[PDB]
Scaffold this active site. Sequence first.
Site, PDB file in Angstrom:
ATOM      1  CB  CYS B   1      -0.929   0.013   1.214  1.00  0.00           C
ATOM      2  SG  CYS B   1      -1.846  -1.516   1.459  1.00  0.00           S
TER       3      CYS B   1
HETATM    4  C1  LIG Z   1      -3.702  -3.613   4.714  1.00  0.00           C
HETATM    5  C2  LIG Z   1      -4.889  -3.699   3.737  1.00  0.00           C
HETATM    6  S1  LIG Z   1      -4.666  -5.037   2.510  1.00  0.00           S
HETATM    7  O1  LIG Z   1      -5.900  -5.239   1.785  1.00  0.00           O
HETATM    8  O2  LIG Z   1      -3.745  -4.663   1.449  1.00  0.00           O
HETATM    9  C3  LIG Z   1      -4.108  -6.652   3.239  1.00  0.00           C
HETATM   10  C4  LIG Z   1      -2.784  -7.033   3.099  1.00  0.00           C
HETATM   11  C5  LIG Z   1      -2.356  -8.221   3.633  1.00  0.00           C
HETATM   12  C6  LIG Z   1      -3.239  -9.035   4.297  1.00  0.00           C
HETATM   13  C7  LIG Z   1      -4.574  -8.651   4.431  1.00  0.00           C
HETATM   14  C8  LIG Z   1      -5.016  -7.473   3.896  1.00  0.00           C
HETATM   15  C9  LIG Z   1      -6.538  -7.033   4.060  1.00  0.00           C
HETATM   16  O3  LIG Z   1      -6.838  -6.377   4.993  1.00  0.00           O
HETATM   17  N1  LIG Z   1      -7.600  -7.445   3.084  1.00  0.00           N
HETATM   18  C10 LIG Z   1      -7.291  -8.211   1.930  1.00  0.00           C
HETATM   19  C11 LIG Z   1      -8.372  -9.046   1.204  1.00  0.00           C
HETATM   20  N2  LIG Z   1      -9.844  -8.855   1.555  1.00  0.00           N
HETATM   21  C12 LIG Z   1     -10.934  -9.430   0.768  1.00  0.00           C
HETATM   22  N3  LIG Z   1     -12.315  -9.055   0.795  1.00  0.00           N
HETATM   23  C13 LIG Z   1     -13.091  -9.913  -0.125  1.00  0.00           C
HETATM   24  C14 LIG Z   1     -14.537  -9.805  -0.360  1.00  0.00           C
HETATM   25  C15 LIG Z   1     -15.173 -10.682  -1.266  1.00  0.00           C
HETATM   26  C16 LIG Z   1     -14.399 -11.674  -1.952  1.00  0.00           C
HETATM   27  F1  LIG Z   1     -15.015 -12.546  -2.843  1.00  0.00           F
HETATM   28  C17 LIG Z   1     -12.997 -11.779  -1.725  1.00  0.00           C
HETATM   29  C18 LIG Z   1     -12.341 -10.887  -0.799  1.00  0.00           C
HETATM   30  S2  LIG Z   1     -10.730 -10.730  -0.303  1.00  0.00           S
HETATM   31  C19 LIG Z   1     -10.008  -8.127   2.885  1.00  0.00           C
HETATM   32  C20 LIG Z   1      -8.974  -7.044   3.223  1.00  0.00           C
HETATM   33  C21 LIG Z   1      -9.266  -5.820   2.340  1.00  0.00           C
END
Ligand SMILES: CCS(=O)(=O)c1ccccc1C(=O)N1CCN(c2nc3ccc(F)cc3s2)C[C@@H]1C
Lengths: 95, 230
Positions: B1
Amino acid sequence: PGPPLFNVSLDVAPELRWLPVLRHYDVELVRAAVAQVIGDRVPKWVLALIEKGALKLERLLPPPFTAEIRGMCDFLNLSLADGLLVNLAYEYSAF
Amino acid sequence: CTSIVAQDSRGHVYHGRNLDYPYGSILRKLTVDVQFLKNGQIAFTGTTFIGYVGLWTGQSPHKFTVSGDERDRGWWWENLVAALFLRHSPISWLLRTTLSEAESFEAAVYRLAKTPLIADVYYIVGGTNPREGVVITRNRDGPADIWPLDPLKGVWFLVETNYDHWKPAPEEDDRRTPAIKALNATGQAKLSLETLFQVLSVVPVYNNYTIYTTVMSAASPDKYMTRIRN
Ligand SMILES: CCS(=O)(=O)c1ccccc1C(=O)N1CCN(c2nc3ccc(F)cc3s2)C[C@@H]1C
Ligand SMILES: COCCOCCOCCOc1ccc(C(C)(C)CC(C)(C)C)cc1
Ligand SMILES: COCCOCCOCCOc1ccc(C(C)(C)CC(C)(C)C)cc1
Ligand SMILES: CC(C)(C)CC(C)(C)c1ccc(OCCOCCO)cc1
Ligand SMILES: CC(C)(C)CC(C)(C)c1ccc(O)cc1
Ligand SMILES: *[C@@H]1O[C@H](CO)[C@@H](O)[C@H](O)[C@H]1NC(C)=O
Ligand SMILES: *[C@@H]1O[C@H](CO)[C@@H](O)[C@H](O)[C@H]1NC(C)=O
Ligand SMILES: [K+]
């Protein structure tokens, strides 16, 4: 034009407030999308144990946080274990 | 990010971020801007994915903007204890709770800095007045460091990628230097949501894992702009 813009009323119960949004989405697209990321990262032996402790895990988490997930899962026919795993993805190093 | 809070030559604070994560083919279709209502009125706005109830990017109109970047998330048994035994908060849930309850940029920094968490994170906060811009390097139990804007000292922007700012970024993943380089060339005078957006569109700040880019300014909440990339 940017992504879709949606309203979510915090005066509606947590289980219900995300459902008007989910109407605009192919339920099967979302289920398969959640299933892909979870299956691609969470080991099969972890998934088995979490599915068996999903109700106990839900009670130990912030109620409003879990109540919104529970409602979206029932509406999407998604498993609570899958909803909690994707919402705790950051807190789980597997993601 | 990549998150950036910066102040222009007139005292206006701008806040932008790039959300980097794989599975872009899936998540680009599920990216949404959500306006959360109280009494029928917009209480705050956020960007998320369908199914994810926490907010990694959000705006409380006329108060503050906030975004969160990944920090070293330690081991799963530490997070497990913090989550289930100690009852600490998920990172994106605290971010959204702050957007909902905090009454001012100052109150938001306090909440985001001292509320116990399940894992580490970087919280970037911007306000509606000059100098209101900080990067909160978070431990589970509190703030490891708070990093404020200091324009009179020559610090009119804060660039957070995914590494501690008081140390040099890795040779293998350095999106900090090109982001700074692109900001110096822009200039505190020409800073804007559009020029800010272009900073976040520079490679490798804008990389193959970037899903969406958001630019916002709590003082101009109607300018909240998210764009899907690729
Ligand atoms: C620090 C924010 S990040 O998105 O880049 C991240 C980096 C490393 C590990 C976890 C995460 C994180 O917080 N998320 C990643 C994936 N996610 C997803 N939401 C859905 C919602 C629906 C679906 F079909 C698949 C997914 S994967 C939730 C969150 C934003
Ligand atoms: C536990 O109720 C919360 C308080 O709600 C006060 C306002 O009324 C909302 C309650 O309505 C429901 C009905 C059903 C449900 C469940 C989760 C059982 C099923 C659902 C969301 C798929 C309809 C949740 C809330
Ligand atoms: C790539 O490195 C990660 C290795 O992943 C496999 C190890 O996982 C073993 C334990 O997995 C979990 C998963 C979830 C959890 C819960 C949901 C109970 C809490 C959490 C998300 C804070 C870890 C606890 C342990
Ligand atoms: C949920 C717990 C943590 C209470 C119990 C279990 C058995 C899962 C546990 C217990 C202990 C444990 O320790 C990890 C090794 O630490 C060495 C430092 O690198 C890991 C897991
Ligand atoms: C640590 C282990 C993966 C072995 C168990 C886990 C988190 C899935 C669990 C099991 C039951 C429960 O109530 C809470 C967590
Ligand atoms: C929903 O999931 C249940 C499993 O609990 C299954 O029996 C049912 O057929 C599913 N319905 C749809 C429409 O997918
Ligand atoms: C959201 O709610 C506000 C106030 O009720 C309304 O003006 C606006 O049109 C709504 N937007 C959507 C997309 O429903
Ligand atoms: K539908």
